[PDB]
């Protein structure tokens, strides 16, 4: 309870938590429903700077793709932790009863099978980030005492 | 930051200052013999040269473990001159010129540790 | 103090964290299925990793 977590003011996340009949998500909804500070932000960018200014006090709940882009393609002062709570999926559409659904669906599955969508994602999300990948090799937490502690 | 080479450059400033007093006392000993018992001034010179050569041996040893090989090259020729003193074991004008260069070399390299140390501490 | 903090609580970390990390160390011999989806996917792969 030390970190207050909030979501968008009017979005799909708030509607999902309002109809989530799960004990893990139910207790989270009643906590976010009654809170003295602002646990709902109208703009996703206003909630982003709120997390950067809270410094470990506001955990914003957003989608996976938007979280990975705002972490890599922006000054990386925040990071994504944990797996996805629910499961969704994007998709291109087509008017009801149109001849441009069959071949289009076959082209989407063909691109996803040939490893093309994974390449386009890794190019626009990682190969073009703002702060980049500084020290890609994750420095393991050295259990030994550092030198600066007794400097 | 705080590296092992940064700490090695800090111990040199305290130790190289003591090497400065040795080469200065050597010029005073040479000046006294030039003006003019005699064994006292020469025996005291033999007791002073041994620590001066042994202390510099640590300067070539500390930087060896500190991976600062760009500074070791500035001290290897100084240690090579000590080998000629131990291998052989007028002379007044020769020793005078062989001592003024020590004061200049031990001072120009002294300012390096005063600046190369800052090039690592504040560069965090 | 540090030796007392060591024996009190233990924090064992995994030697790896992703697939792009083990492809650079090459210290752990990793294996897959003989014939299936994983083998066919790793066969025709355009990404470098």
């Amino acid at each position: 309870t030390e970190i207050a977590y909030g979501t968008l003011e009017a979005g799909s996340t708030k509607e999902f938590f309002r109809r989530s009949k799960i004990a893990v998500f139910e207790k989270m909804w009643t906590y976010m429903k009654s809170a003295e500070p602002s646990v709902f932000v109208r703009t996703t960018e206003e909630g982003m700077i709120r997390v950067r200014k809270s410094k470990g006090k506001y955990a914003y709940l957003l989608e996976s793709t938007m979280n990975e882009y705002i972490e890599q393609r922006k000054p990386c002062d925040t990071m994504k932790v944990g797996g996805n709570l629910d499961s969704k999926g994007y998709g291109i559409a087509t008017p009801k009863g149109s001849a441009l659904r069959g071949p289009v669906n076959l082209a989407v599955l063909k691109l996803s099978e040939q490893g093309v969508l994974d390449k386009l994602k890794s190019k626009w999300w990682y190969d073009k980030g703002e702060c980049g990948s500084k020290d890609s090799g994750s420095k393991d937490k050295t259990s030994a005492l550092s030198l600066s502690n007794v400097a | 930051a705080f590296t092992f080479a940064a700490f090695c450059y800090m111990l040199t400033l305290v130790l190289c200052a003591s090497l400065i007093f040795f080469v200065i006392w050597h010029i005073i000993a040479f000046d006294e013999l030039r003006t003019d018992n005699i064994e006292r001034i020469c025996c005291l010179l033999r007791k002073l040269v041994v620590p001066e050569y042994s202390i510099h041996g640590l300067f070539c040893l500390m930087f060896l473990c500190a991976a600062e090989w760009v500074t070791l090259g500035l001290n290897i020729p100084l240690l090579f001159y000590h080998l000629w003193r131990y291998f052989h074991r007028d002379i007044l004008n020769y020793c005078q010129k062989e001592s003024w260069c020590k004061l200049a070399f031990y001072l120009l390299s002294f300012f390096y540790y005063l600046y190369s140390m800052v090039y690592t501490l504040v560069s965090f | 103090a540090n030796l007392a903090a060591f024996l009190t609580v233990e924090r064992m970390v995994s030697p790896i964290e992703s697939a792009e990390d083990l492809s650079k160390q090459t210290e752990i011999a990793y294996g897959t299925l003989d014939s299936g989806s994983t083998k066919e996917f790793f066969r025709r792969s355009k990404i470098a990793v």
Binding site: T142, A144, L145, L147 | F4, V14, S18, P51 | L3, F6
Partner: peptide, 28 residues
């Protein structure tokens, strides 16, 4: 409990303190 960078700093600080004390006990 102590990183390898500190163990290398202790030995050279030990010898450094020793030679400094020897130099101080020499001018007298």
């Amino acid at each position: 409990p102590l990183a390898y960078e500190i163990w290398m700093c202790i030995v050279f600080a030990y010898i450094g303190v020793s030679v400094v004390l020897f130099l101080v006990s020499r001018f007298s």
